[PDB]
Design a protein around this ligand. Structure first.
Ligand SMILES: *[C@@H]1O[C@H](CO)[C@@H](O[C@@H]2O[C@H](CO)[C@@H](O)[C@H](O)[C@H]2NC(C)=O)[C@H](O)[C@H]1NC(C)=O
Ligand SMILES: *[C@@H]1O[C@H](CO)[C@@H](O)[C@H](O)[C@H]1NC(C)=O
Ligand SMILES: *[C@@H]1O[C@H](CO)[C@@H](O)[C@H](O)[C@H]1NC(C)=O
Ligand SMILES: *[C@@H]1O[C@H](CO)[C@@H](O)[C@H](O)[C@H]1NC(C)=O
Ligand SMILES: *[C@@H]1O[C@H](CO)[C@@H](O)[C@H](O)[C@H]1NC(C)=O
Ligand SMILES: *[C@@H]1O[C@H](CO)[C@@H](O)[C@H](O)[C@H]1NC(C)=O
Ligand SMILES: *[C@@H]1O[C@H](CO)[C@@H](O)[C@H](O)[C@H]1NC(C)=O
Ligand SMILES: *[C@@H]1O[C@H](CO)[C@@H](O)[C@H](O)[C@H]1NC(C)=O
Ligand SMILES: *[C@@H]1O[C@H](CO)[C@@H](O)[C@H](O)[C@H]1NC(C)=O
Ligand SMILES: *[C@@H]1O[C@H](CO)[C@@H](O)[C@H](O)[C@H]1NC(C)=O
Ligand SMILES: *[C@@H]1O[C@H](CO)[C@@H](O)[C@H](O)[C@H]1NC(C)=O
Ligand SMILES: *[C@@H]1O[C@H](CO)[C@@H](O)[C@H](O)[C@H]1NC(C)=O
Ligand SMILES: *[C@@H]1O[C@H](CO)[C@@H](O)[C@H](O)[C@H]1NC(C)=O
Ligand SMILES: *[C@@H]1O[C@H](CO)[C@@H](O)[C@H](O)[C@H]1NC(C)=O
Ligand SMILES: *[C@@H]1O[C@H](CO)[C@@H](O)[C@H](O)[C@H]1NC(C)=O
Ligand SMILES: *[C@@H]1O[C@H](CO)[C@@H](O)[C@H](O)[C@H]1NC(C)=O
Ligand SMILES: N[C@@H](CCCC[NH3+])C(=O)O
Ligand SMILES: N[C@@H](CCCC[NH3+])C(=O)O
Ligand SMILES: [Zn+2]
Ligand SMILES: [Zn+2]
Lengths: 860, 849
């Protein structure tokens, strides 16, 4: 047979309007039966209706006009694009409506994509079942035949026949649960709002709810009976944020109910389905005592993210997958925005600032690609799911929110959504909304497009001569060729004048060079206030010194953000070479008076990275000298740490940082205190509570003794707190018993005492420290086929593994070895971004040493 | 523009006498030279061609008229062009005056510095000419074939005791303060055995029969050369009795040179040794120490006949004397030093040769040498040991008495002349009366690589015998002397010469078990048809003492070897060794412990820890009684205390029962005593090993190594430090030793070897070799015995295709030379062979260890 469609995209010809879907899922037998009624509308004359289906045993297919007589239509198949074509026995005329009915049988998914299912072991030793969905991106067509593209928005009637013991859920509220004569229940849910096919949702599980009503909408967290006590905070928070987003966006959450569900499975699909927000149990659970600081921040973030998406993504969808970064970028921004507004106390701007640092690092590589690309096949569609894009977007919106007013941003947003509700959008449409709120004073589209269409970010260079501030732009490239790179850069700047004459302004650098006229002569100048702009700034020798000297006199004239920024940049610029590593260590000598966590963490991140690179070569004196030096600057702040959980989240994070550093390197009191804490804890059979802020540190010091290691392993297999288990595992993997380390990796690959999902984390941890450095990479090498079977070549896990196991190499010999090995696999494995990023990194490492290593001896 | 373009000198001119006058300064490394060569032309030739390198020719006169010099440094030659035609039969006198620098690389005429007991910068100088280094010290006809007589005279300072081949004739105090020693005219000898030593030494001489035997050590260390003397005396007698040809020179000096990089050579009358290899203490040295000193003295002594008296013509036949010295090394000991049980060493060494010779990397010992560097290749223990092995086969095939007569004759028939390997075989032809060919027989051994697999089948009163190449993965035919032994309790034994691919032997009686190759006197591994293995396997269980320890250990080795090549399943190998509960002989127990450690270490590296730990618990369960009986002393015969070290070192290594604790108890005492309270030398390494497992013990031992005087104790301390499970200390050891920081660069190879045998240091040792390749190559040149040992020690446990690919790739990226190198192709071969071992044997093990 011949197929009438030879394209990845569906034709514009026919358009869905309504969807009546009835399903009969049998979770114990992991199969289902389904019936779809699709009301379409033709626009062009056609003799075929091409839409999406996969893994469907089609029982009956019937076509209609109005004539209530169902006419038997023939169905064609083409598995390559997951398409089916319906041959209609009557031509379909423009404007005319038609209704298609399809009946089918299918399997509930073994994987955790599509309509997936699993079984869990209840608190009663009683084995239970559960089914859910995860359609993003291309998985709704697995669940039911449909038009599976974001632009084809329709309404949905969802009906499932469940079993009485189960709570069945879906997008909309439950219209009618009507008992069937055999012990089965035919649940019906109200007809949905005009929405995208990938956002359709349903869940069948034995579940409890915790509920509350906010204005009209009834928010509800559904958890498994045995863990409903742990979703209190979840709801409490979803209340605060829903309030906020509705107030911010000024468009009201369009449904009467909002459900969040803590799925009891680690591999589970977590996403922002309209009204049915899915999450991994793990990522929603919170105990107001027994949980961590990072624990609060994490779930508070994920709720925000998934909620922000309700408006940015579900109400205003992207026409196609090439604009995903816009919706995830927005969600990832509101993630941190909303949290400053409501959870100011969390200090999540600290996390956001780190994220941004980490993004820039990965973006500045040759391996990086622009966020705005042309996406054709299912591979390029799945390639669009990477935090780099999400985070670059996030960053670009902050740069835009800081350039225009806070209030200007909001009103563009408000206009954007309102104007485009229940429609499909292109990236530009957002910029156009920004264009109009600026009274055409800026372009924004022109401006943003320089960021979105180009890889990487610019390096701004700054020179002060009198009252003249000279700005220069250039692509921040790390040595290893074109000049089309020009970014429209919102430069902010801050200054101190005629004795504590604080001044600040902003100016657009749309050209390769320019000059700012300063109102008066200044002692120092700082560009990119709070690193709100996605760029690195380099300074002329005397301008750097102007900042290096200021930090020594009073660093508090600058924010913790700016101060962290300077610490980041100088170390990055030392890497490039535009500044000697000396100056880098010069700038950070101010640290004695630094009491804010952000700059201290960044200094620690920089110095631990250098330490480990040198450690891995034979240079152990330099490595030690480096650590004693840094310890000296932070001696007081370290000696000031109480081993507790008291203080603001920020200063709680400072404790975990300063204590880990000090313990890792066994400096002063640290080891002995943690060991006493460890012994006491072991002695309680682990029944004594340890302060969450000092847990990992304490556990590590423990694991350094067979007794400790053994007890920890014991507790890992016994206890039930997953987060405590991860902190426990970190310690085990931080041992210096090469044999133990090996065992831990072997075990996780065999899924033996640790599940395979933990493997990358084990490899990352082993590979970081000296006794397991070569071990970790050898394990990766020799177990390559078993790894690639267990995580597909292109998954995030395998990228994590390759990075984790190789990023600390810095010799031509290792470069040779690494390359060789992937060349010895195939050419398709050796062409993978993660393999090319790997080898780019080893080169940059080699280049780092052959630029900074020899001079090192003579200081620190 | 130069006449002679060839490696080997012209036949035409020939040396007779040498007037060698040297004025060497010890402080400055330079010397003034004068040689007068009295020659004789055998053809009428226009120019004299000889060897000379690194010489500034002051005056070159020919007699009384000056002659024009020419140079071709590529061949290391110089040409003297004669005024007249040198007419055949006529003697002429060639005299050269030259300047040159005293060597530092411990080759040619070398020297060094050392600090005294009183801590002073004393000097010393010496020679190492073999093969090609006389050319550098003095011009001459530097080939072994050209024998002559040597009058050497060296101008020395008053404080130095300058030595040479022949005894000192005179000494005249010059007007400068300087003393000029002259040494007697030498016997007719090859240029490469000419030697001279200038240094501040004491003597310990003791007449035997006119010829004065003397051990020359530095002043402070004269107390340890007593065993040395005692031993040379005994041995000298022996060889004079056995070879029945009196040691020619009036003197015999064994000098203990005060450096670890000195050259040890069998120079006629002036035997050079590394200080360490002769120093012995009857209280504080172990059995291996005692064997080592005894063995080496003998080796160099055997040479005074085999390689000095009777020399070889060209370098290719080196294996012969070297093999003979190596055999005599073990014979002499078995006759006079009988209690040392050194046959255990000879057997072991035989086995290890066998393993290296069983590779495609192997070369036949009778190759042709033409290349400047092919000469250096002839220096490898594989050629010396093979030679040794087959000399042994021959001794045992013919009579011990027949053997001797063939020797005595050859030495007489060839005294002071230059031979070829065939000449030894010729000398065997007549003692056999041309019954046995011998000459054609030995040629089947020496001209083709490897050795035979004699497969055996027994049916009634007859045993069937086929032979083939022993290849692990072509037609090779050896003339194999098959000694065998059978068993109402009828202990019958016989030989049979097999010269064809297939054979059959007739038996007097039908027999329970047969055992081919008695005491493994023959350089072949024997396989049996299934029920013949079981026959031997049963006997070992029933009563193993019907066979010798030698036979027993031979079986142990053969079955495991075969098991790798797949002619036997590994289960059957392990089945054989199940008799070990009844074994009280050290020979077998070591060979089993060796075999099982190799498997254990191969497994452990691949991560099969349980399988590896089941393996050692099995072997332990067999040797349980023995281990438990042993005392923590030195009380026992040399063989039995060799067993003490073996059993205790096994049991401690794997933390089995009694050991760890007992050894830690002896550690904690010794450490507390600040290292003074004596430790039995048989438990020492095992005591230190257990101690070095703590940061306390490790740091103490380190403090000792840098501080204590005994090198023998030091080497036991380093092996323990390198036995630490902390990758940081291991890395450090290799690092420190490369920069020569607290451990000389000489010890490096030993550290890398030790580090990469254990799990924490396995990837670390090889990584260090790759990352310091260039640096390793400067310290030890390509083809060095050290760099071969390094590439082996760090790669021999890699048993995966990924490793094999990596190892290859690495060397390829170095050079085509580096990549097409003996040890580099060998290493890769060994990896595949490990790979092949796994795919044959790994899957089965789960079910039966
Ligand atoms: C060549 O030189 C050697 C000596 O260098 C001569 O050999 C000596 O000859 C005499 C008799 O003429 C003997 O008594 C000596 O014993 C020989 N000494 C040695 C060391 O061999 C030889 O005769 C000379 N030949 C010619 C042709 O003049
Ligand atoms: C569901 O699983 C069965 C297992 O036999 C398989 O054969 C079939 O392909 C699946 N059903 C459909 C409609 O794909
Ligand atoms: C039928 O088509 C007309 C447009 O041609 C449209 O206005 C109407 O809403 C459609 N009705 C249904 C039920 O699809
Ligand atoms: C599924 O099938 C099983 C066994 O036939 C039955 O016990 C159960 O009630 C069914 N449930 C549903 C929801 O169809
Ligand atoms: C490096 O970047 C340039 C673009 O500036 C590109 O053409 C080239 O293919 C890149 N190479 C690699 C290995 O990424
Ligand atoms: C800076 O000042 C000069 C006059 O000195 C003027 O020409 C220029 O336009 C000024 N730039 C800005 C941005 O105001
Ligand atoms: C940190 O210290 C300085 C003075 O030493 C002070 O001005 C500043 O307020 C401190 N930081 C905070 C957050 O209190
Ligand atoms: C430690 O506590 C757990 C209960 O949480 C228990 O299962 C385990 O047996 C305890 N061990 C001892 C030795 O009391
Ligand atoms: C001695 O050494 C110097 C270099 O130190 C060298 O130039 C010279 O050729 C040597 N002299 C002789 C006579 O060999
Ligand atoms: C070696 O040279 C030094 C002076 O350079 C001198 O004191 C010593 O006597 C010399 N020895 C000889 C044997 O020439
Ligand atoms: C050293 O040699 C001389 C003879 O040259 C001898 O008289 C003396 O006894 C020897 N010294 C010793 C300690 O044997
Ligand atoms: C001692 O030397 C003489 C020759 O001077 C020799 O005849 C005799 O055989 C030798 N005796 C011994 C026992 O070696
Ligand atoms: C002595 O040597 C010659 C070869 O040079 C040999 O042919 C001859 O057979 C030998 N004679 C004896 C008696 O060993
Ligand atoms: C063995 O004996 C048989 C007669 O029983 C005889 O024919 C044969 O020649 C003998 N074989 C050998 C190798 O002596
Ligand atoms: C070993 O034991 C056997 C008896 O089983 C005995 O004949 C032999 O002498 C023993 N050997 C030693 C060295 O103990
Ligand atoms: C241990 O003894 C050695 C000499 O044997 C001495 O040098 C060292 O100082 C002693 N150690 C202590 C701690 O006194
Ligand atoms: N974008 C969703 C995750 C979807 C997962 C896609 N496989 C949140 O965040
Ligand atoms: N053939 C000697 C060793 C010679 C060493 C040459 N570098 C034995 O002993
Ligand atoms: Zn998202
Ligand atoms: Zn030798």
């Amino acid at each position: 047979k011949l197929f009438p469609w030879a394209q990845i995209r569906l034709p514009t010809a026919v358009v869905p309007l309504r969807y009546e879907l009835s399903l009969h899922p049998n979770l114990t037998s992991m199969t289902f039966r389904g019936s779809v009624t699709i009301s379409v509308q033709a626009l062009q004359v056609t003799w075929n209706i091409i839409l999406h289906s996969t893994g469907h045993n089609i029982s009956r297919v019937t076509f209609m006009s109005v004539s209530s007589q169902e006419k038997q239509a023939e169905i064609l198949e083409y598995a390559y694009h997951g398409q089916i074509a319906i041959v209609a026995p009557e031509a379909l005329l423009a404007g005319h409506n038609y209704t298609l009915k399809i009946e089918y049988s299918a399997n509930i998914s073994s994987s955790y994509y599509g309509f997936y299912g699993f079984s869990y072991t209840d608190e009663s030793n009683e084995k239970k079942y559960f089914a859910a969905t995860q359609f993003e991106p291309l998985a709704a067509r697995s669940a039911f035949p449909c038009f599976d593209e974001p632009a084809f928005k329709a309404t949905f009637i969802i009906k499932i026949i469940r079993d009485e013991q189960y709570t069945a859920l879906s997008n909309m509220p439950k219209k009618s649960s009507v008992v069937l004569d055999d012990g089965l229940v035919q649940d019906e849910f109200s007809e949905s709002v005009k929405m995208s096919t990938y956002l359709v949702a349903f869940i069948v599980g034995e579940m409890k709810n915790l509920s509350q009503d906010v204005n009209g909408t009834l928010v509800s967290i559904y958890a498994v009976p045995e863990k409903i006590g742990q979703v209190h905070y979840a709801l409490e928070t979803t209340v605060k944020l829903l309030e906020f987003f509705q107030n911010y966006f000024e468009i009201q959450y369009p449904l009467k109910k909002l459900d969040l569900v803590a799925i009891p499975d680690f591999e589970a699909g977590a996403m922002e389905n309209w009204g049915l927000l899915t999450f991994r149990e793990e990522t929603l659970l919170y105990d107001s005592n027994t949980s961590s600081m990072a624990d609060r921040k994490l779930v508070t973030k994920i709720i925000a993210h998934e909620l922000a998406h309700q408006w940015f993504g579900n109400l205003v969808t992207m026409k196609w997958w090439n604009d995903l970064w816009l919706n995830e970028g927005f969600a990832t921004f509101m993630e941190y925005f909303s949290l400053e507004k409501i959870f100011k106390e969390l200090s999540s701007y600290e996390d956001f600032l780190d994220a941004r640092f980490k993004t820039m690092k990965k973006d500045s590589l040759n391996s990086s690609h622009p966020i705005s690309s042309s996406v054709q096949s299912s591979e390029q569609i799945e390639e669009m799911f990477d935090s780099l894009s999400y985070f670059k977007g996030s960053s670009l919106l902050l740069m835009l929110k800081t350039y225009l007013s806070e209030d200007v941003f909001q009103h563009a947003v408000v206009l954007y959504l309102h104007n485009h509700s229940y429609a499909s959008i292109q990236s530009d449409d957002l910029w156009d909304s920004f264009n109009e709120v600026t009274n055409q004073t800026l372009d924004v589209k022109r401006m943003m497009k320089t960021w979105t269409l180009q890889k990487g970010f610019p390096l701004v260079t700054v020179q002060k001569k009198g009252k003249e501030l000279f700005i220069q732009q250039e692509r921040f490239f790390l040595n290893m060729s074109d000049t089309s790179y020009l970014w429209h850069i919102p430069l902010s700047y801050v200054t101190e004048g005629r004795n504590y004459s604080k001044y600040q302004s902003v100016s657009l650098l749309d050209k390769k060079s320019g000059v700012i006229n300063l109102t008066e002569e200044v002692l120092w100048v700082k560009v990119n206030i709070n690193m709100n702009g996605y760029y690195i700034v380099h300074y002329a020798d005397d301008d750097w010194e102007a900042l290096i000297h200021q930090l020594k006199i009073n660093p508090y004239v600058l924010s913790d953000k700016d101060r962290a920024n300077l610490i980041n940049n100088i170390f990055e610029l030392a890497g490039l070479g535009k500044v000697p590593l000396k100056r880098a260590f010069d700038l950070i000598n101010y640290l004695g008076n630094e009491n804010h966590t952000a700059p201290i963490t960044e200094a620690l991140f920089q110095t631990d990275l250098i330490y480990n690179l040198l450690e891995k070569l034979g240079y152990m004196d330099l490595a030690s000298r480096l650590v004693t030096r840094v310890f000296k600057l932070l001696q007081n702040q370290i000696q000031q740490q109480t081993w507790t959980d008291e203080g603001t989240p920020s200063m709680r994070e400072l404790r975990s940082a300063l204590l880990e550093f000090a313990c890792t390197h066994n400096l002063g009191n640290c080891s002995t205190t943690a060991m006493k804490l460890f012994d006491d804890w072991m002695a309680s059979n682990g029944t004594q509570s340890l302060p969450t802020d000092v847990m990992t540190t304490v556990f590590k010091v423990g694991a350094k003794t067979d007794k400790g290691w053994s007890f920890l392993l014991g507790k890992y297999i016994s206890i039930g707190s997953e987060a405590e288990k991860n902190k426990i595992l970190e310690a085990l993997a931080s041992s210096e018993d090469v044999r133990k380390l090996y065992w831990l990796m072997k075990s996780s690959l065999n899924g033996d005492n640790f599940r395979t999902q933990k493997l990358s984390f084990i490899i990352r941890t082993v590979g970081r420290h000296f006794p397991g450095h070569l071990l970790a990479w050898d394990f990766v090498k020799e177990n390559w086929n078993k790894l690639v079977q267990k995580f597909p070549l292109g998954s995030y896990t395998i990228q994590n593994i390759v990075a984790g196991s190789t990023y600390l190499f810095s010799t031509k010999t290792h470069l040779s070895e690494v390359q060789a090995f992937f060349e010895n696999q195939s050419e398709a494995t050796f062409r993978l971004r993660c393999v090319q990023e790997a080898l780019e990194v080893i080169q940059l490492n080699i280049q780092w040493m052959e630029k900074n290593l020899k001079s090192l001896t003579w200081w620190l």
